[PDB]
Every structure is written in structure tokens, then in C-alpha cells.
Amino acid sequence: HMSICTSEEWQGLMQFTLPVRLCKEIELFHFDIGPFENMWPGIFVYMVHRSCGTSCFELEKLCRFIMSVKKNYRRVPYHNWKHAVTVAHCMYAILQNNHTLFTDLERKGLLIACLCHDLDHRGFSNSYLQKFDHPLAALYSTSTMEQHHFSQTVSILQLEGHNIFSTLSSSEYEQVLEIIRKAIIATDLALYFGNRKQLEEMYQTGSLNLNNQSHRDRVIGLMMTACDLCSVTKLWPVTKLTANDIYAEFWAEGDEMKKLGIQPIPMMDRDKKDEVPQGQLGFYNAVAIPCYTTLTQILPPTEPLLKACRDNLSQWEKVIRG
Numbered sequence: 001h002m003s004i005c006t007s008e009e010w011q012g013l014m015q016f017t018l019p020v021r022l023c024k025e026i027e028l029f030h031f032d033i034g035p036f037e038n039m040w041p042g043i044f045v046y047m048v049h050r051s052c053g054t055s056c057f058e059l060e061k062l063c064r065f066i067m068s069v070k071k072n073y074r075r076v077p078y079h080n081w082k083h084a085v086t087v088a089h090c091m092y093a094i095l096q097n098n099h100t101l102f103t104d105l106e107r108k109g110l111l112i113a114c115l116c117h118d119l120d121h122r123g124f125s126n127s128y129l130q131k132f133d134h135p136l137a138a139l140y141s142t143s144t145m146e147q148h149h150f151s152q153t154v155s156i157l158q159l160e161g162h163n164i165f166s167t168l169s170s171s172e173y174e175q176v177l178e179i180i181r182k183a184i185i186a187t188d189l190a191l192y193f194g195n196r197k198q199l200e201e202m203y204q205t206g207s208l209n210l211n212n213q214s215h216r217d218r219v220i221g222l223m224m225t226a227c228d229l230c231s232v233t234k235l236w237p238v239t240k241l242t243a244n245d246i247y248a249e250f251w252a253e254g255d256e257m258k259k260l261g262i263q264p265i266p267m268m269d270r271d272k273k274d275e276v277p278q279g280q281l282g283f284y285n286a287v288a289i290p291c292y293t294t295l296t297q298i299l300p301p302t303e304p305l306l307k308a309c310r311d312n313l314s315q316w317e318k319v320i321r322g
Ligand SMILES: O=C1c2cccc3cccc(c23)C(=O)N1CCc1n[nH]c(=S)n1-c1ccccc1
Pocket: 189, 228, 229, 231, 232, 246, 266, 267, 276, 278, 279, 280, 282, 283, 284, 286, 287
């Protein structure tokens, strides 16, 4: 039950070359992929080749994976193909600015994870699936969709000529799958709040340590959160357009709850558009600012994400003042 990409799709990606005026600007954290839709698969190829190397994966296998991943994202307002690449980009930028801090296997795994991290998203949250006993909620009682997103990733790997990790040893093959499983489960915001508070307490008391494996998972978790909300780190007008995509997805989920007769949460209620500014202002103070605050403390090169998130909070404060 997986959509296989066509032969022309992946062939055309192999022959794609990134224009030189973009080479410079893909390295910048604030980079917006939005205006280059046709170039997204090739932008993921480029980022892989720059981070891990031109001989990292077999180009033929890699272009099948990417284009099959694209075909298994749905046409929903926010959690879609665009989002996957935007998240992969933010990781690339982070990884590029802290390169030798991570392994080849970790660099390999996290970009692959970011591209697959919302595979086959239906536009619905964990709470919606659990409340109306959806089959996927019966299968995965906690972090529902995220487990499915890992399970979808593993299925693409298992397709014919798609397994980019084939050439790793069976030991490294199961290492990088645990990196991918862990990184994709971390994208559930329900986990972020636990993760961040720990890292701050670890940081402030001086006990945070990167050769400590338990801590690598927590730092990778925060990076995966940092990337998943990177729409709040782009230039003001871009961040405002991505916000509309998000609410459109929340409001469709609202409509489904109103059909069954249940008042949704304000964030998912299209009649409470007035409060949205107070909703963003809250999200930045309670989630986003604290996220990049702790990320920049661990990885000082990731500061531009904190700066852009603050600059957008200012804009959200000006919105409320009229
Ligand atoms: O839920 C998300 C959200 C989830 C996942 C990725 C996101 C990326 C960017 C912005 C948002 C999100 C975002 O803005 N909101 C919440 C915004 C919001 N609108 N109304 C209320 S209330 N809130 C809110 C949610 C959490 C904390 C504070 C406010």
C-alpha cells in the first residue's frame, strides 16, 4: 500500500542541476523554498550531497526514494510535500553550521527523517484520531501519526530499488533506523515540552554532554522540533502565509468536530479568527522562543533561528496593537 514513483519522475531528477544563484542562498536559515516548487526534489538531492557527499547514497536509488516520498504526501493545506522539504532544509542549515559535531550516519539519517517525518498525513491531529477510535489510534496508542510516519518511511525503504541504506552494514542499518524512528517520534509536540525542560536543566547545571548517548537523543529531538516549526523563523510575510496554511488544516478538523456536534478548541475553530494573534503570541512565548532559546544555547551557530523567531514575535505584537 505505497505509491511507486514513475521512471520519468526520478530520471528527470538525476538530470536536474541547481542554479548557481541558489547555491549561495540554500545555506541561509531564513531561505524560503516556496517560490521554487519544480526544484524541491533536486534541492533535497543537493543538500544530501553537500552534507554527506556526492558518493553517500547511489544517485539512482536516492532519486527513486525522494520522488516516491513526494507521491505519498497528500494534497492537504499544511502537512504536505512543501512542509517536508522546508523541514529538511532547516536541518541541512543546522547540520552545515555544526558539522563535525555529528556523524555521517546521523547526518544521513536526520535529512532522510525530515523528508519522511509527516509521510501520509491526513490533515488530522493525534487527539482527533484517538477520540473517534480511528484504526491508526488502535494501532499506535501514543504519538499516533508519528509512529505511522516511521512505519511509512520503512515501507518506502523496502520497495524495489528504493533502499538507499542497502550499502551500509546490517549494524549501521539498524543504528540509522533508530535515529530515524527517534527523530520522527520527536516531531510530536506532546514530547517537545518534556524534552526542552530537561535540556535546560541539563544545560544550566553543566551536566549536558554530547558523547553521552541519552543526551544525543534529546538534542536531536530539539533539532527535530526546531526544524518542524521553522516557518516561525522566515521573513515576516512568508511566516504570515505559512500561518494561513496551518489554520486551514486546523479549521477543516474543526468542521468535522462540529458535524458530530462537538465544540472544538479555539485554534481549530474558524469562527474564532479574531483570537489568532493572541494564539500566535502565545505559541511563540510558550513553545517557539523557548525552543530556539535552548537550541542556540546548545548550538550557538543556530542563533539566526532565534533572531528570526523574535523578529516575527514583534510583528505579532504589532498585529495585536492595530
Ligand atoms: O498548534 C500550532 C502549531 C503546531 C505545529 C506546528 C506549528 C508551526 C507554526 C505555528 C503553529 C504550529 C501554531 O501557531 N500553532 C498554534 C497557534 C495557536 N492558534 N491558537 C492558539 S490558542 N494557538 C496556540 C497553540 C499553542 C500554544 C499557544 C497558542
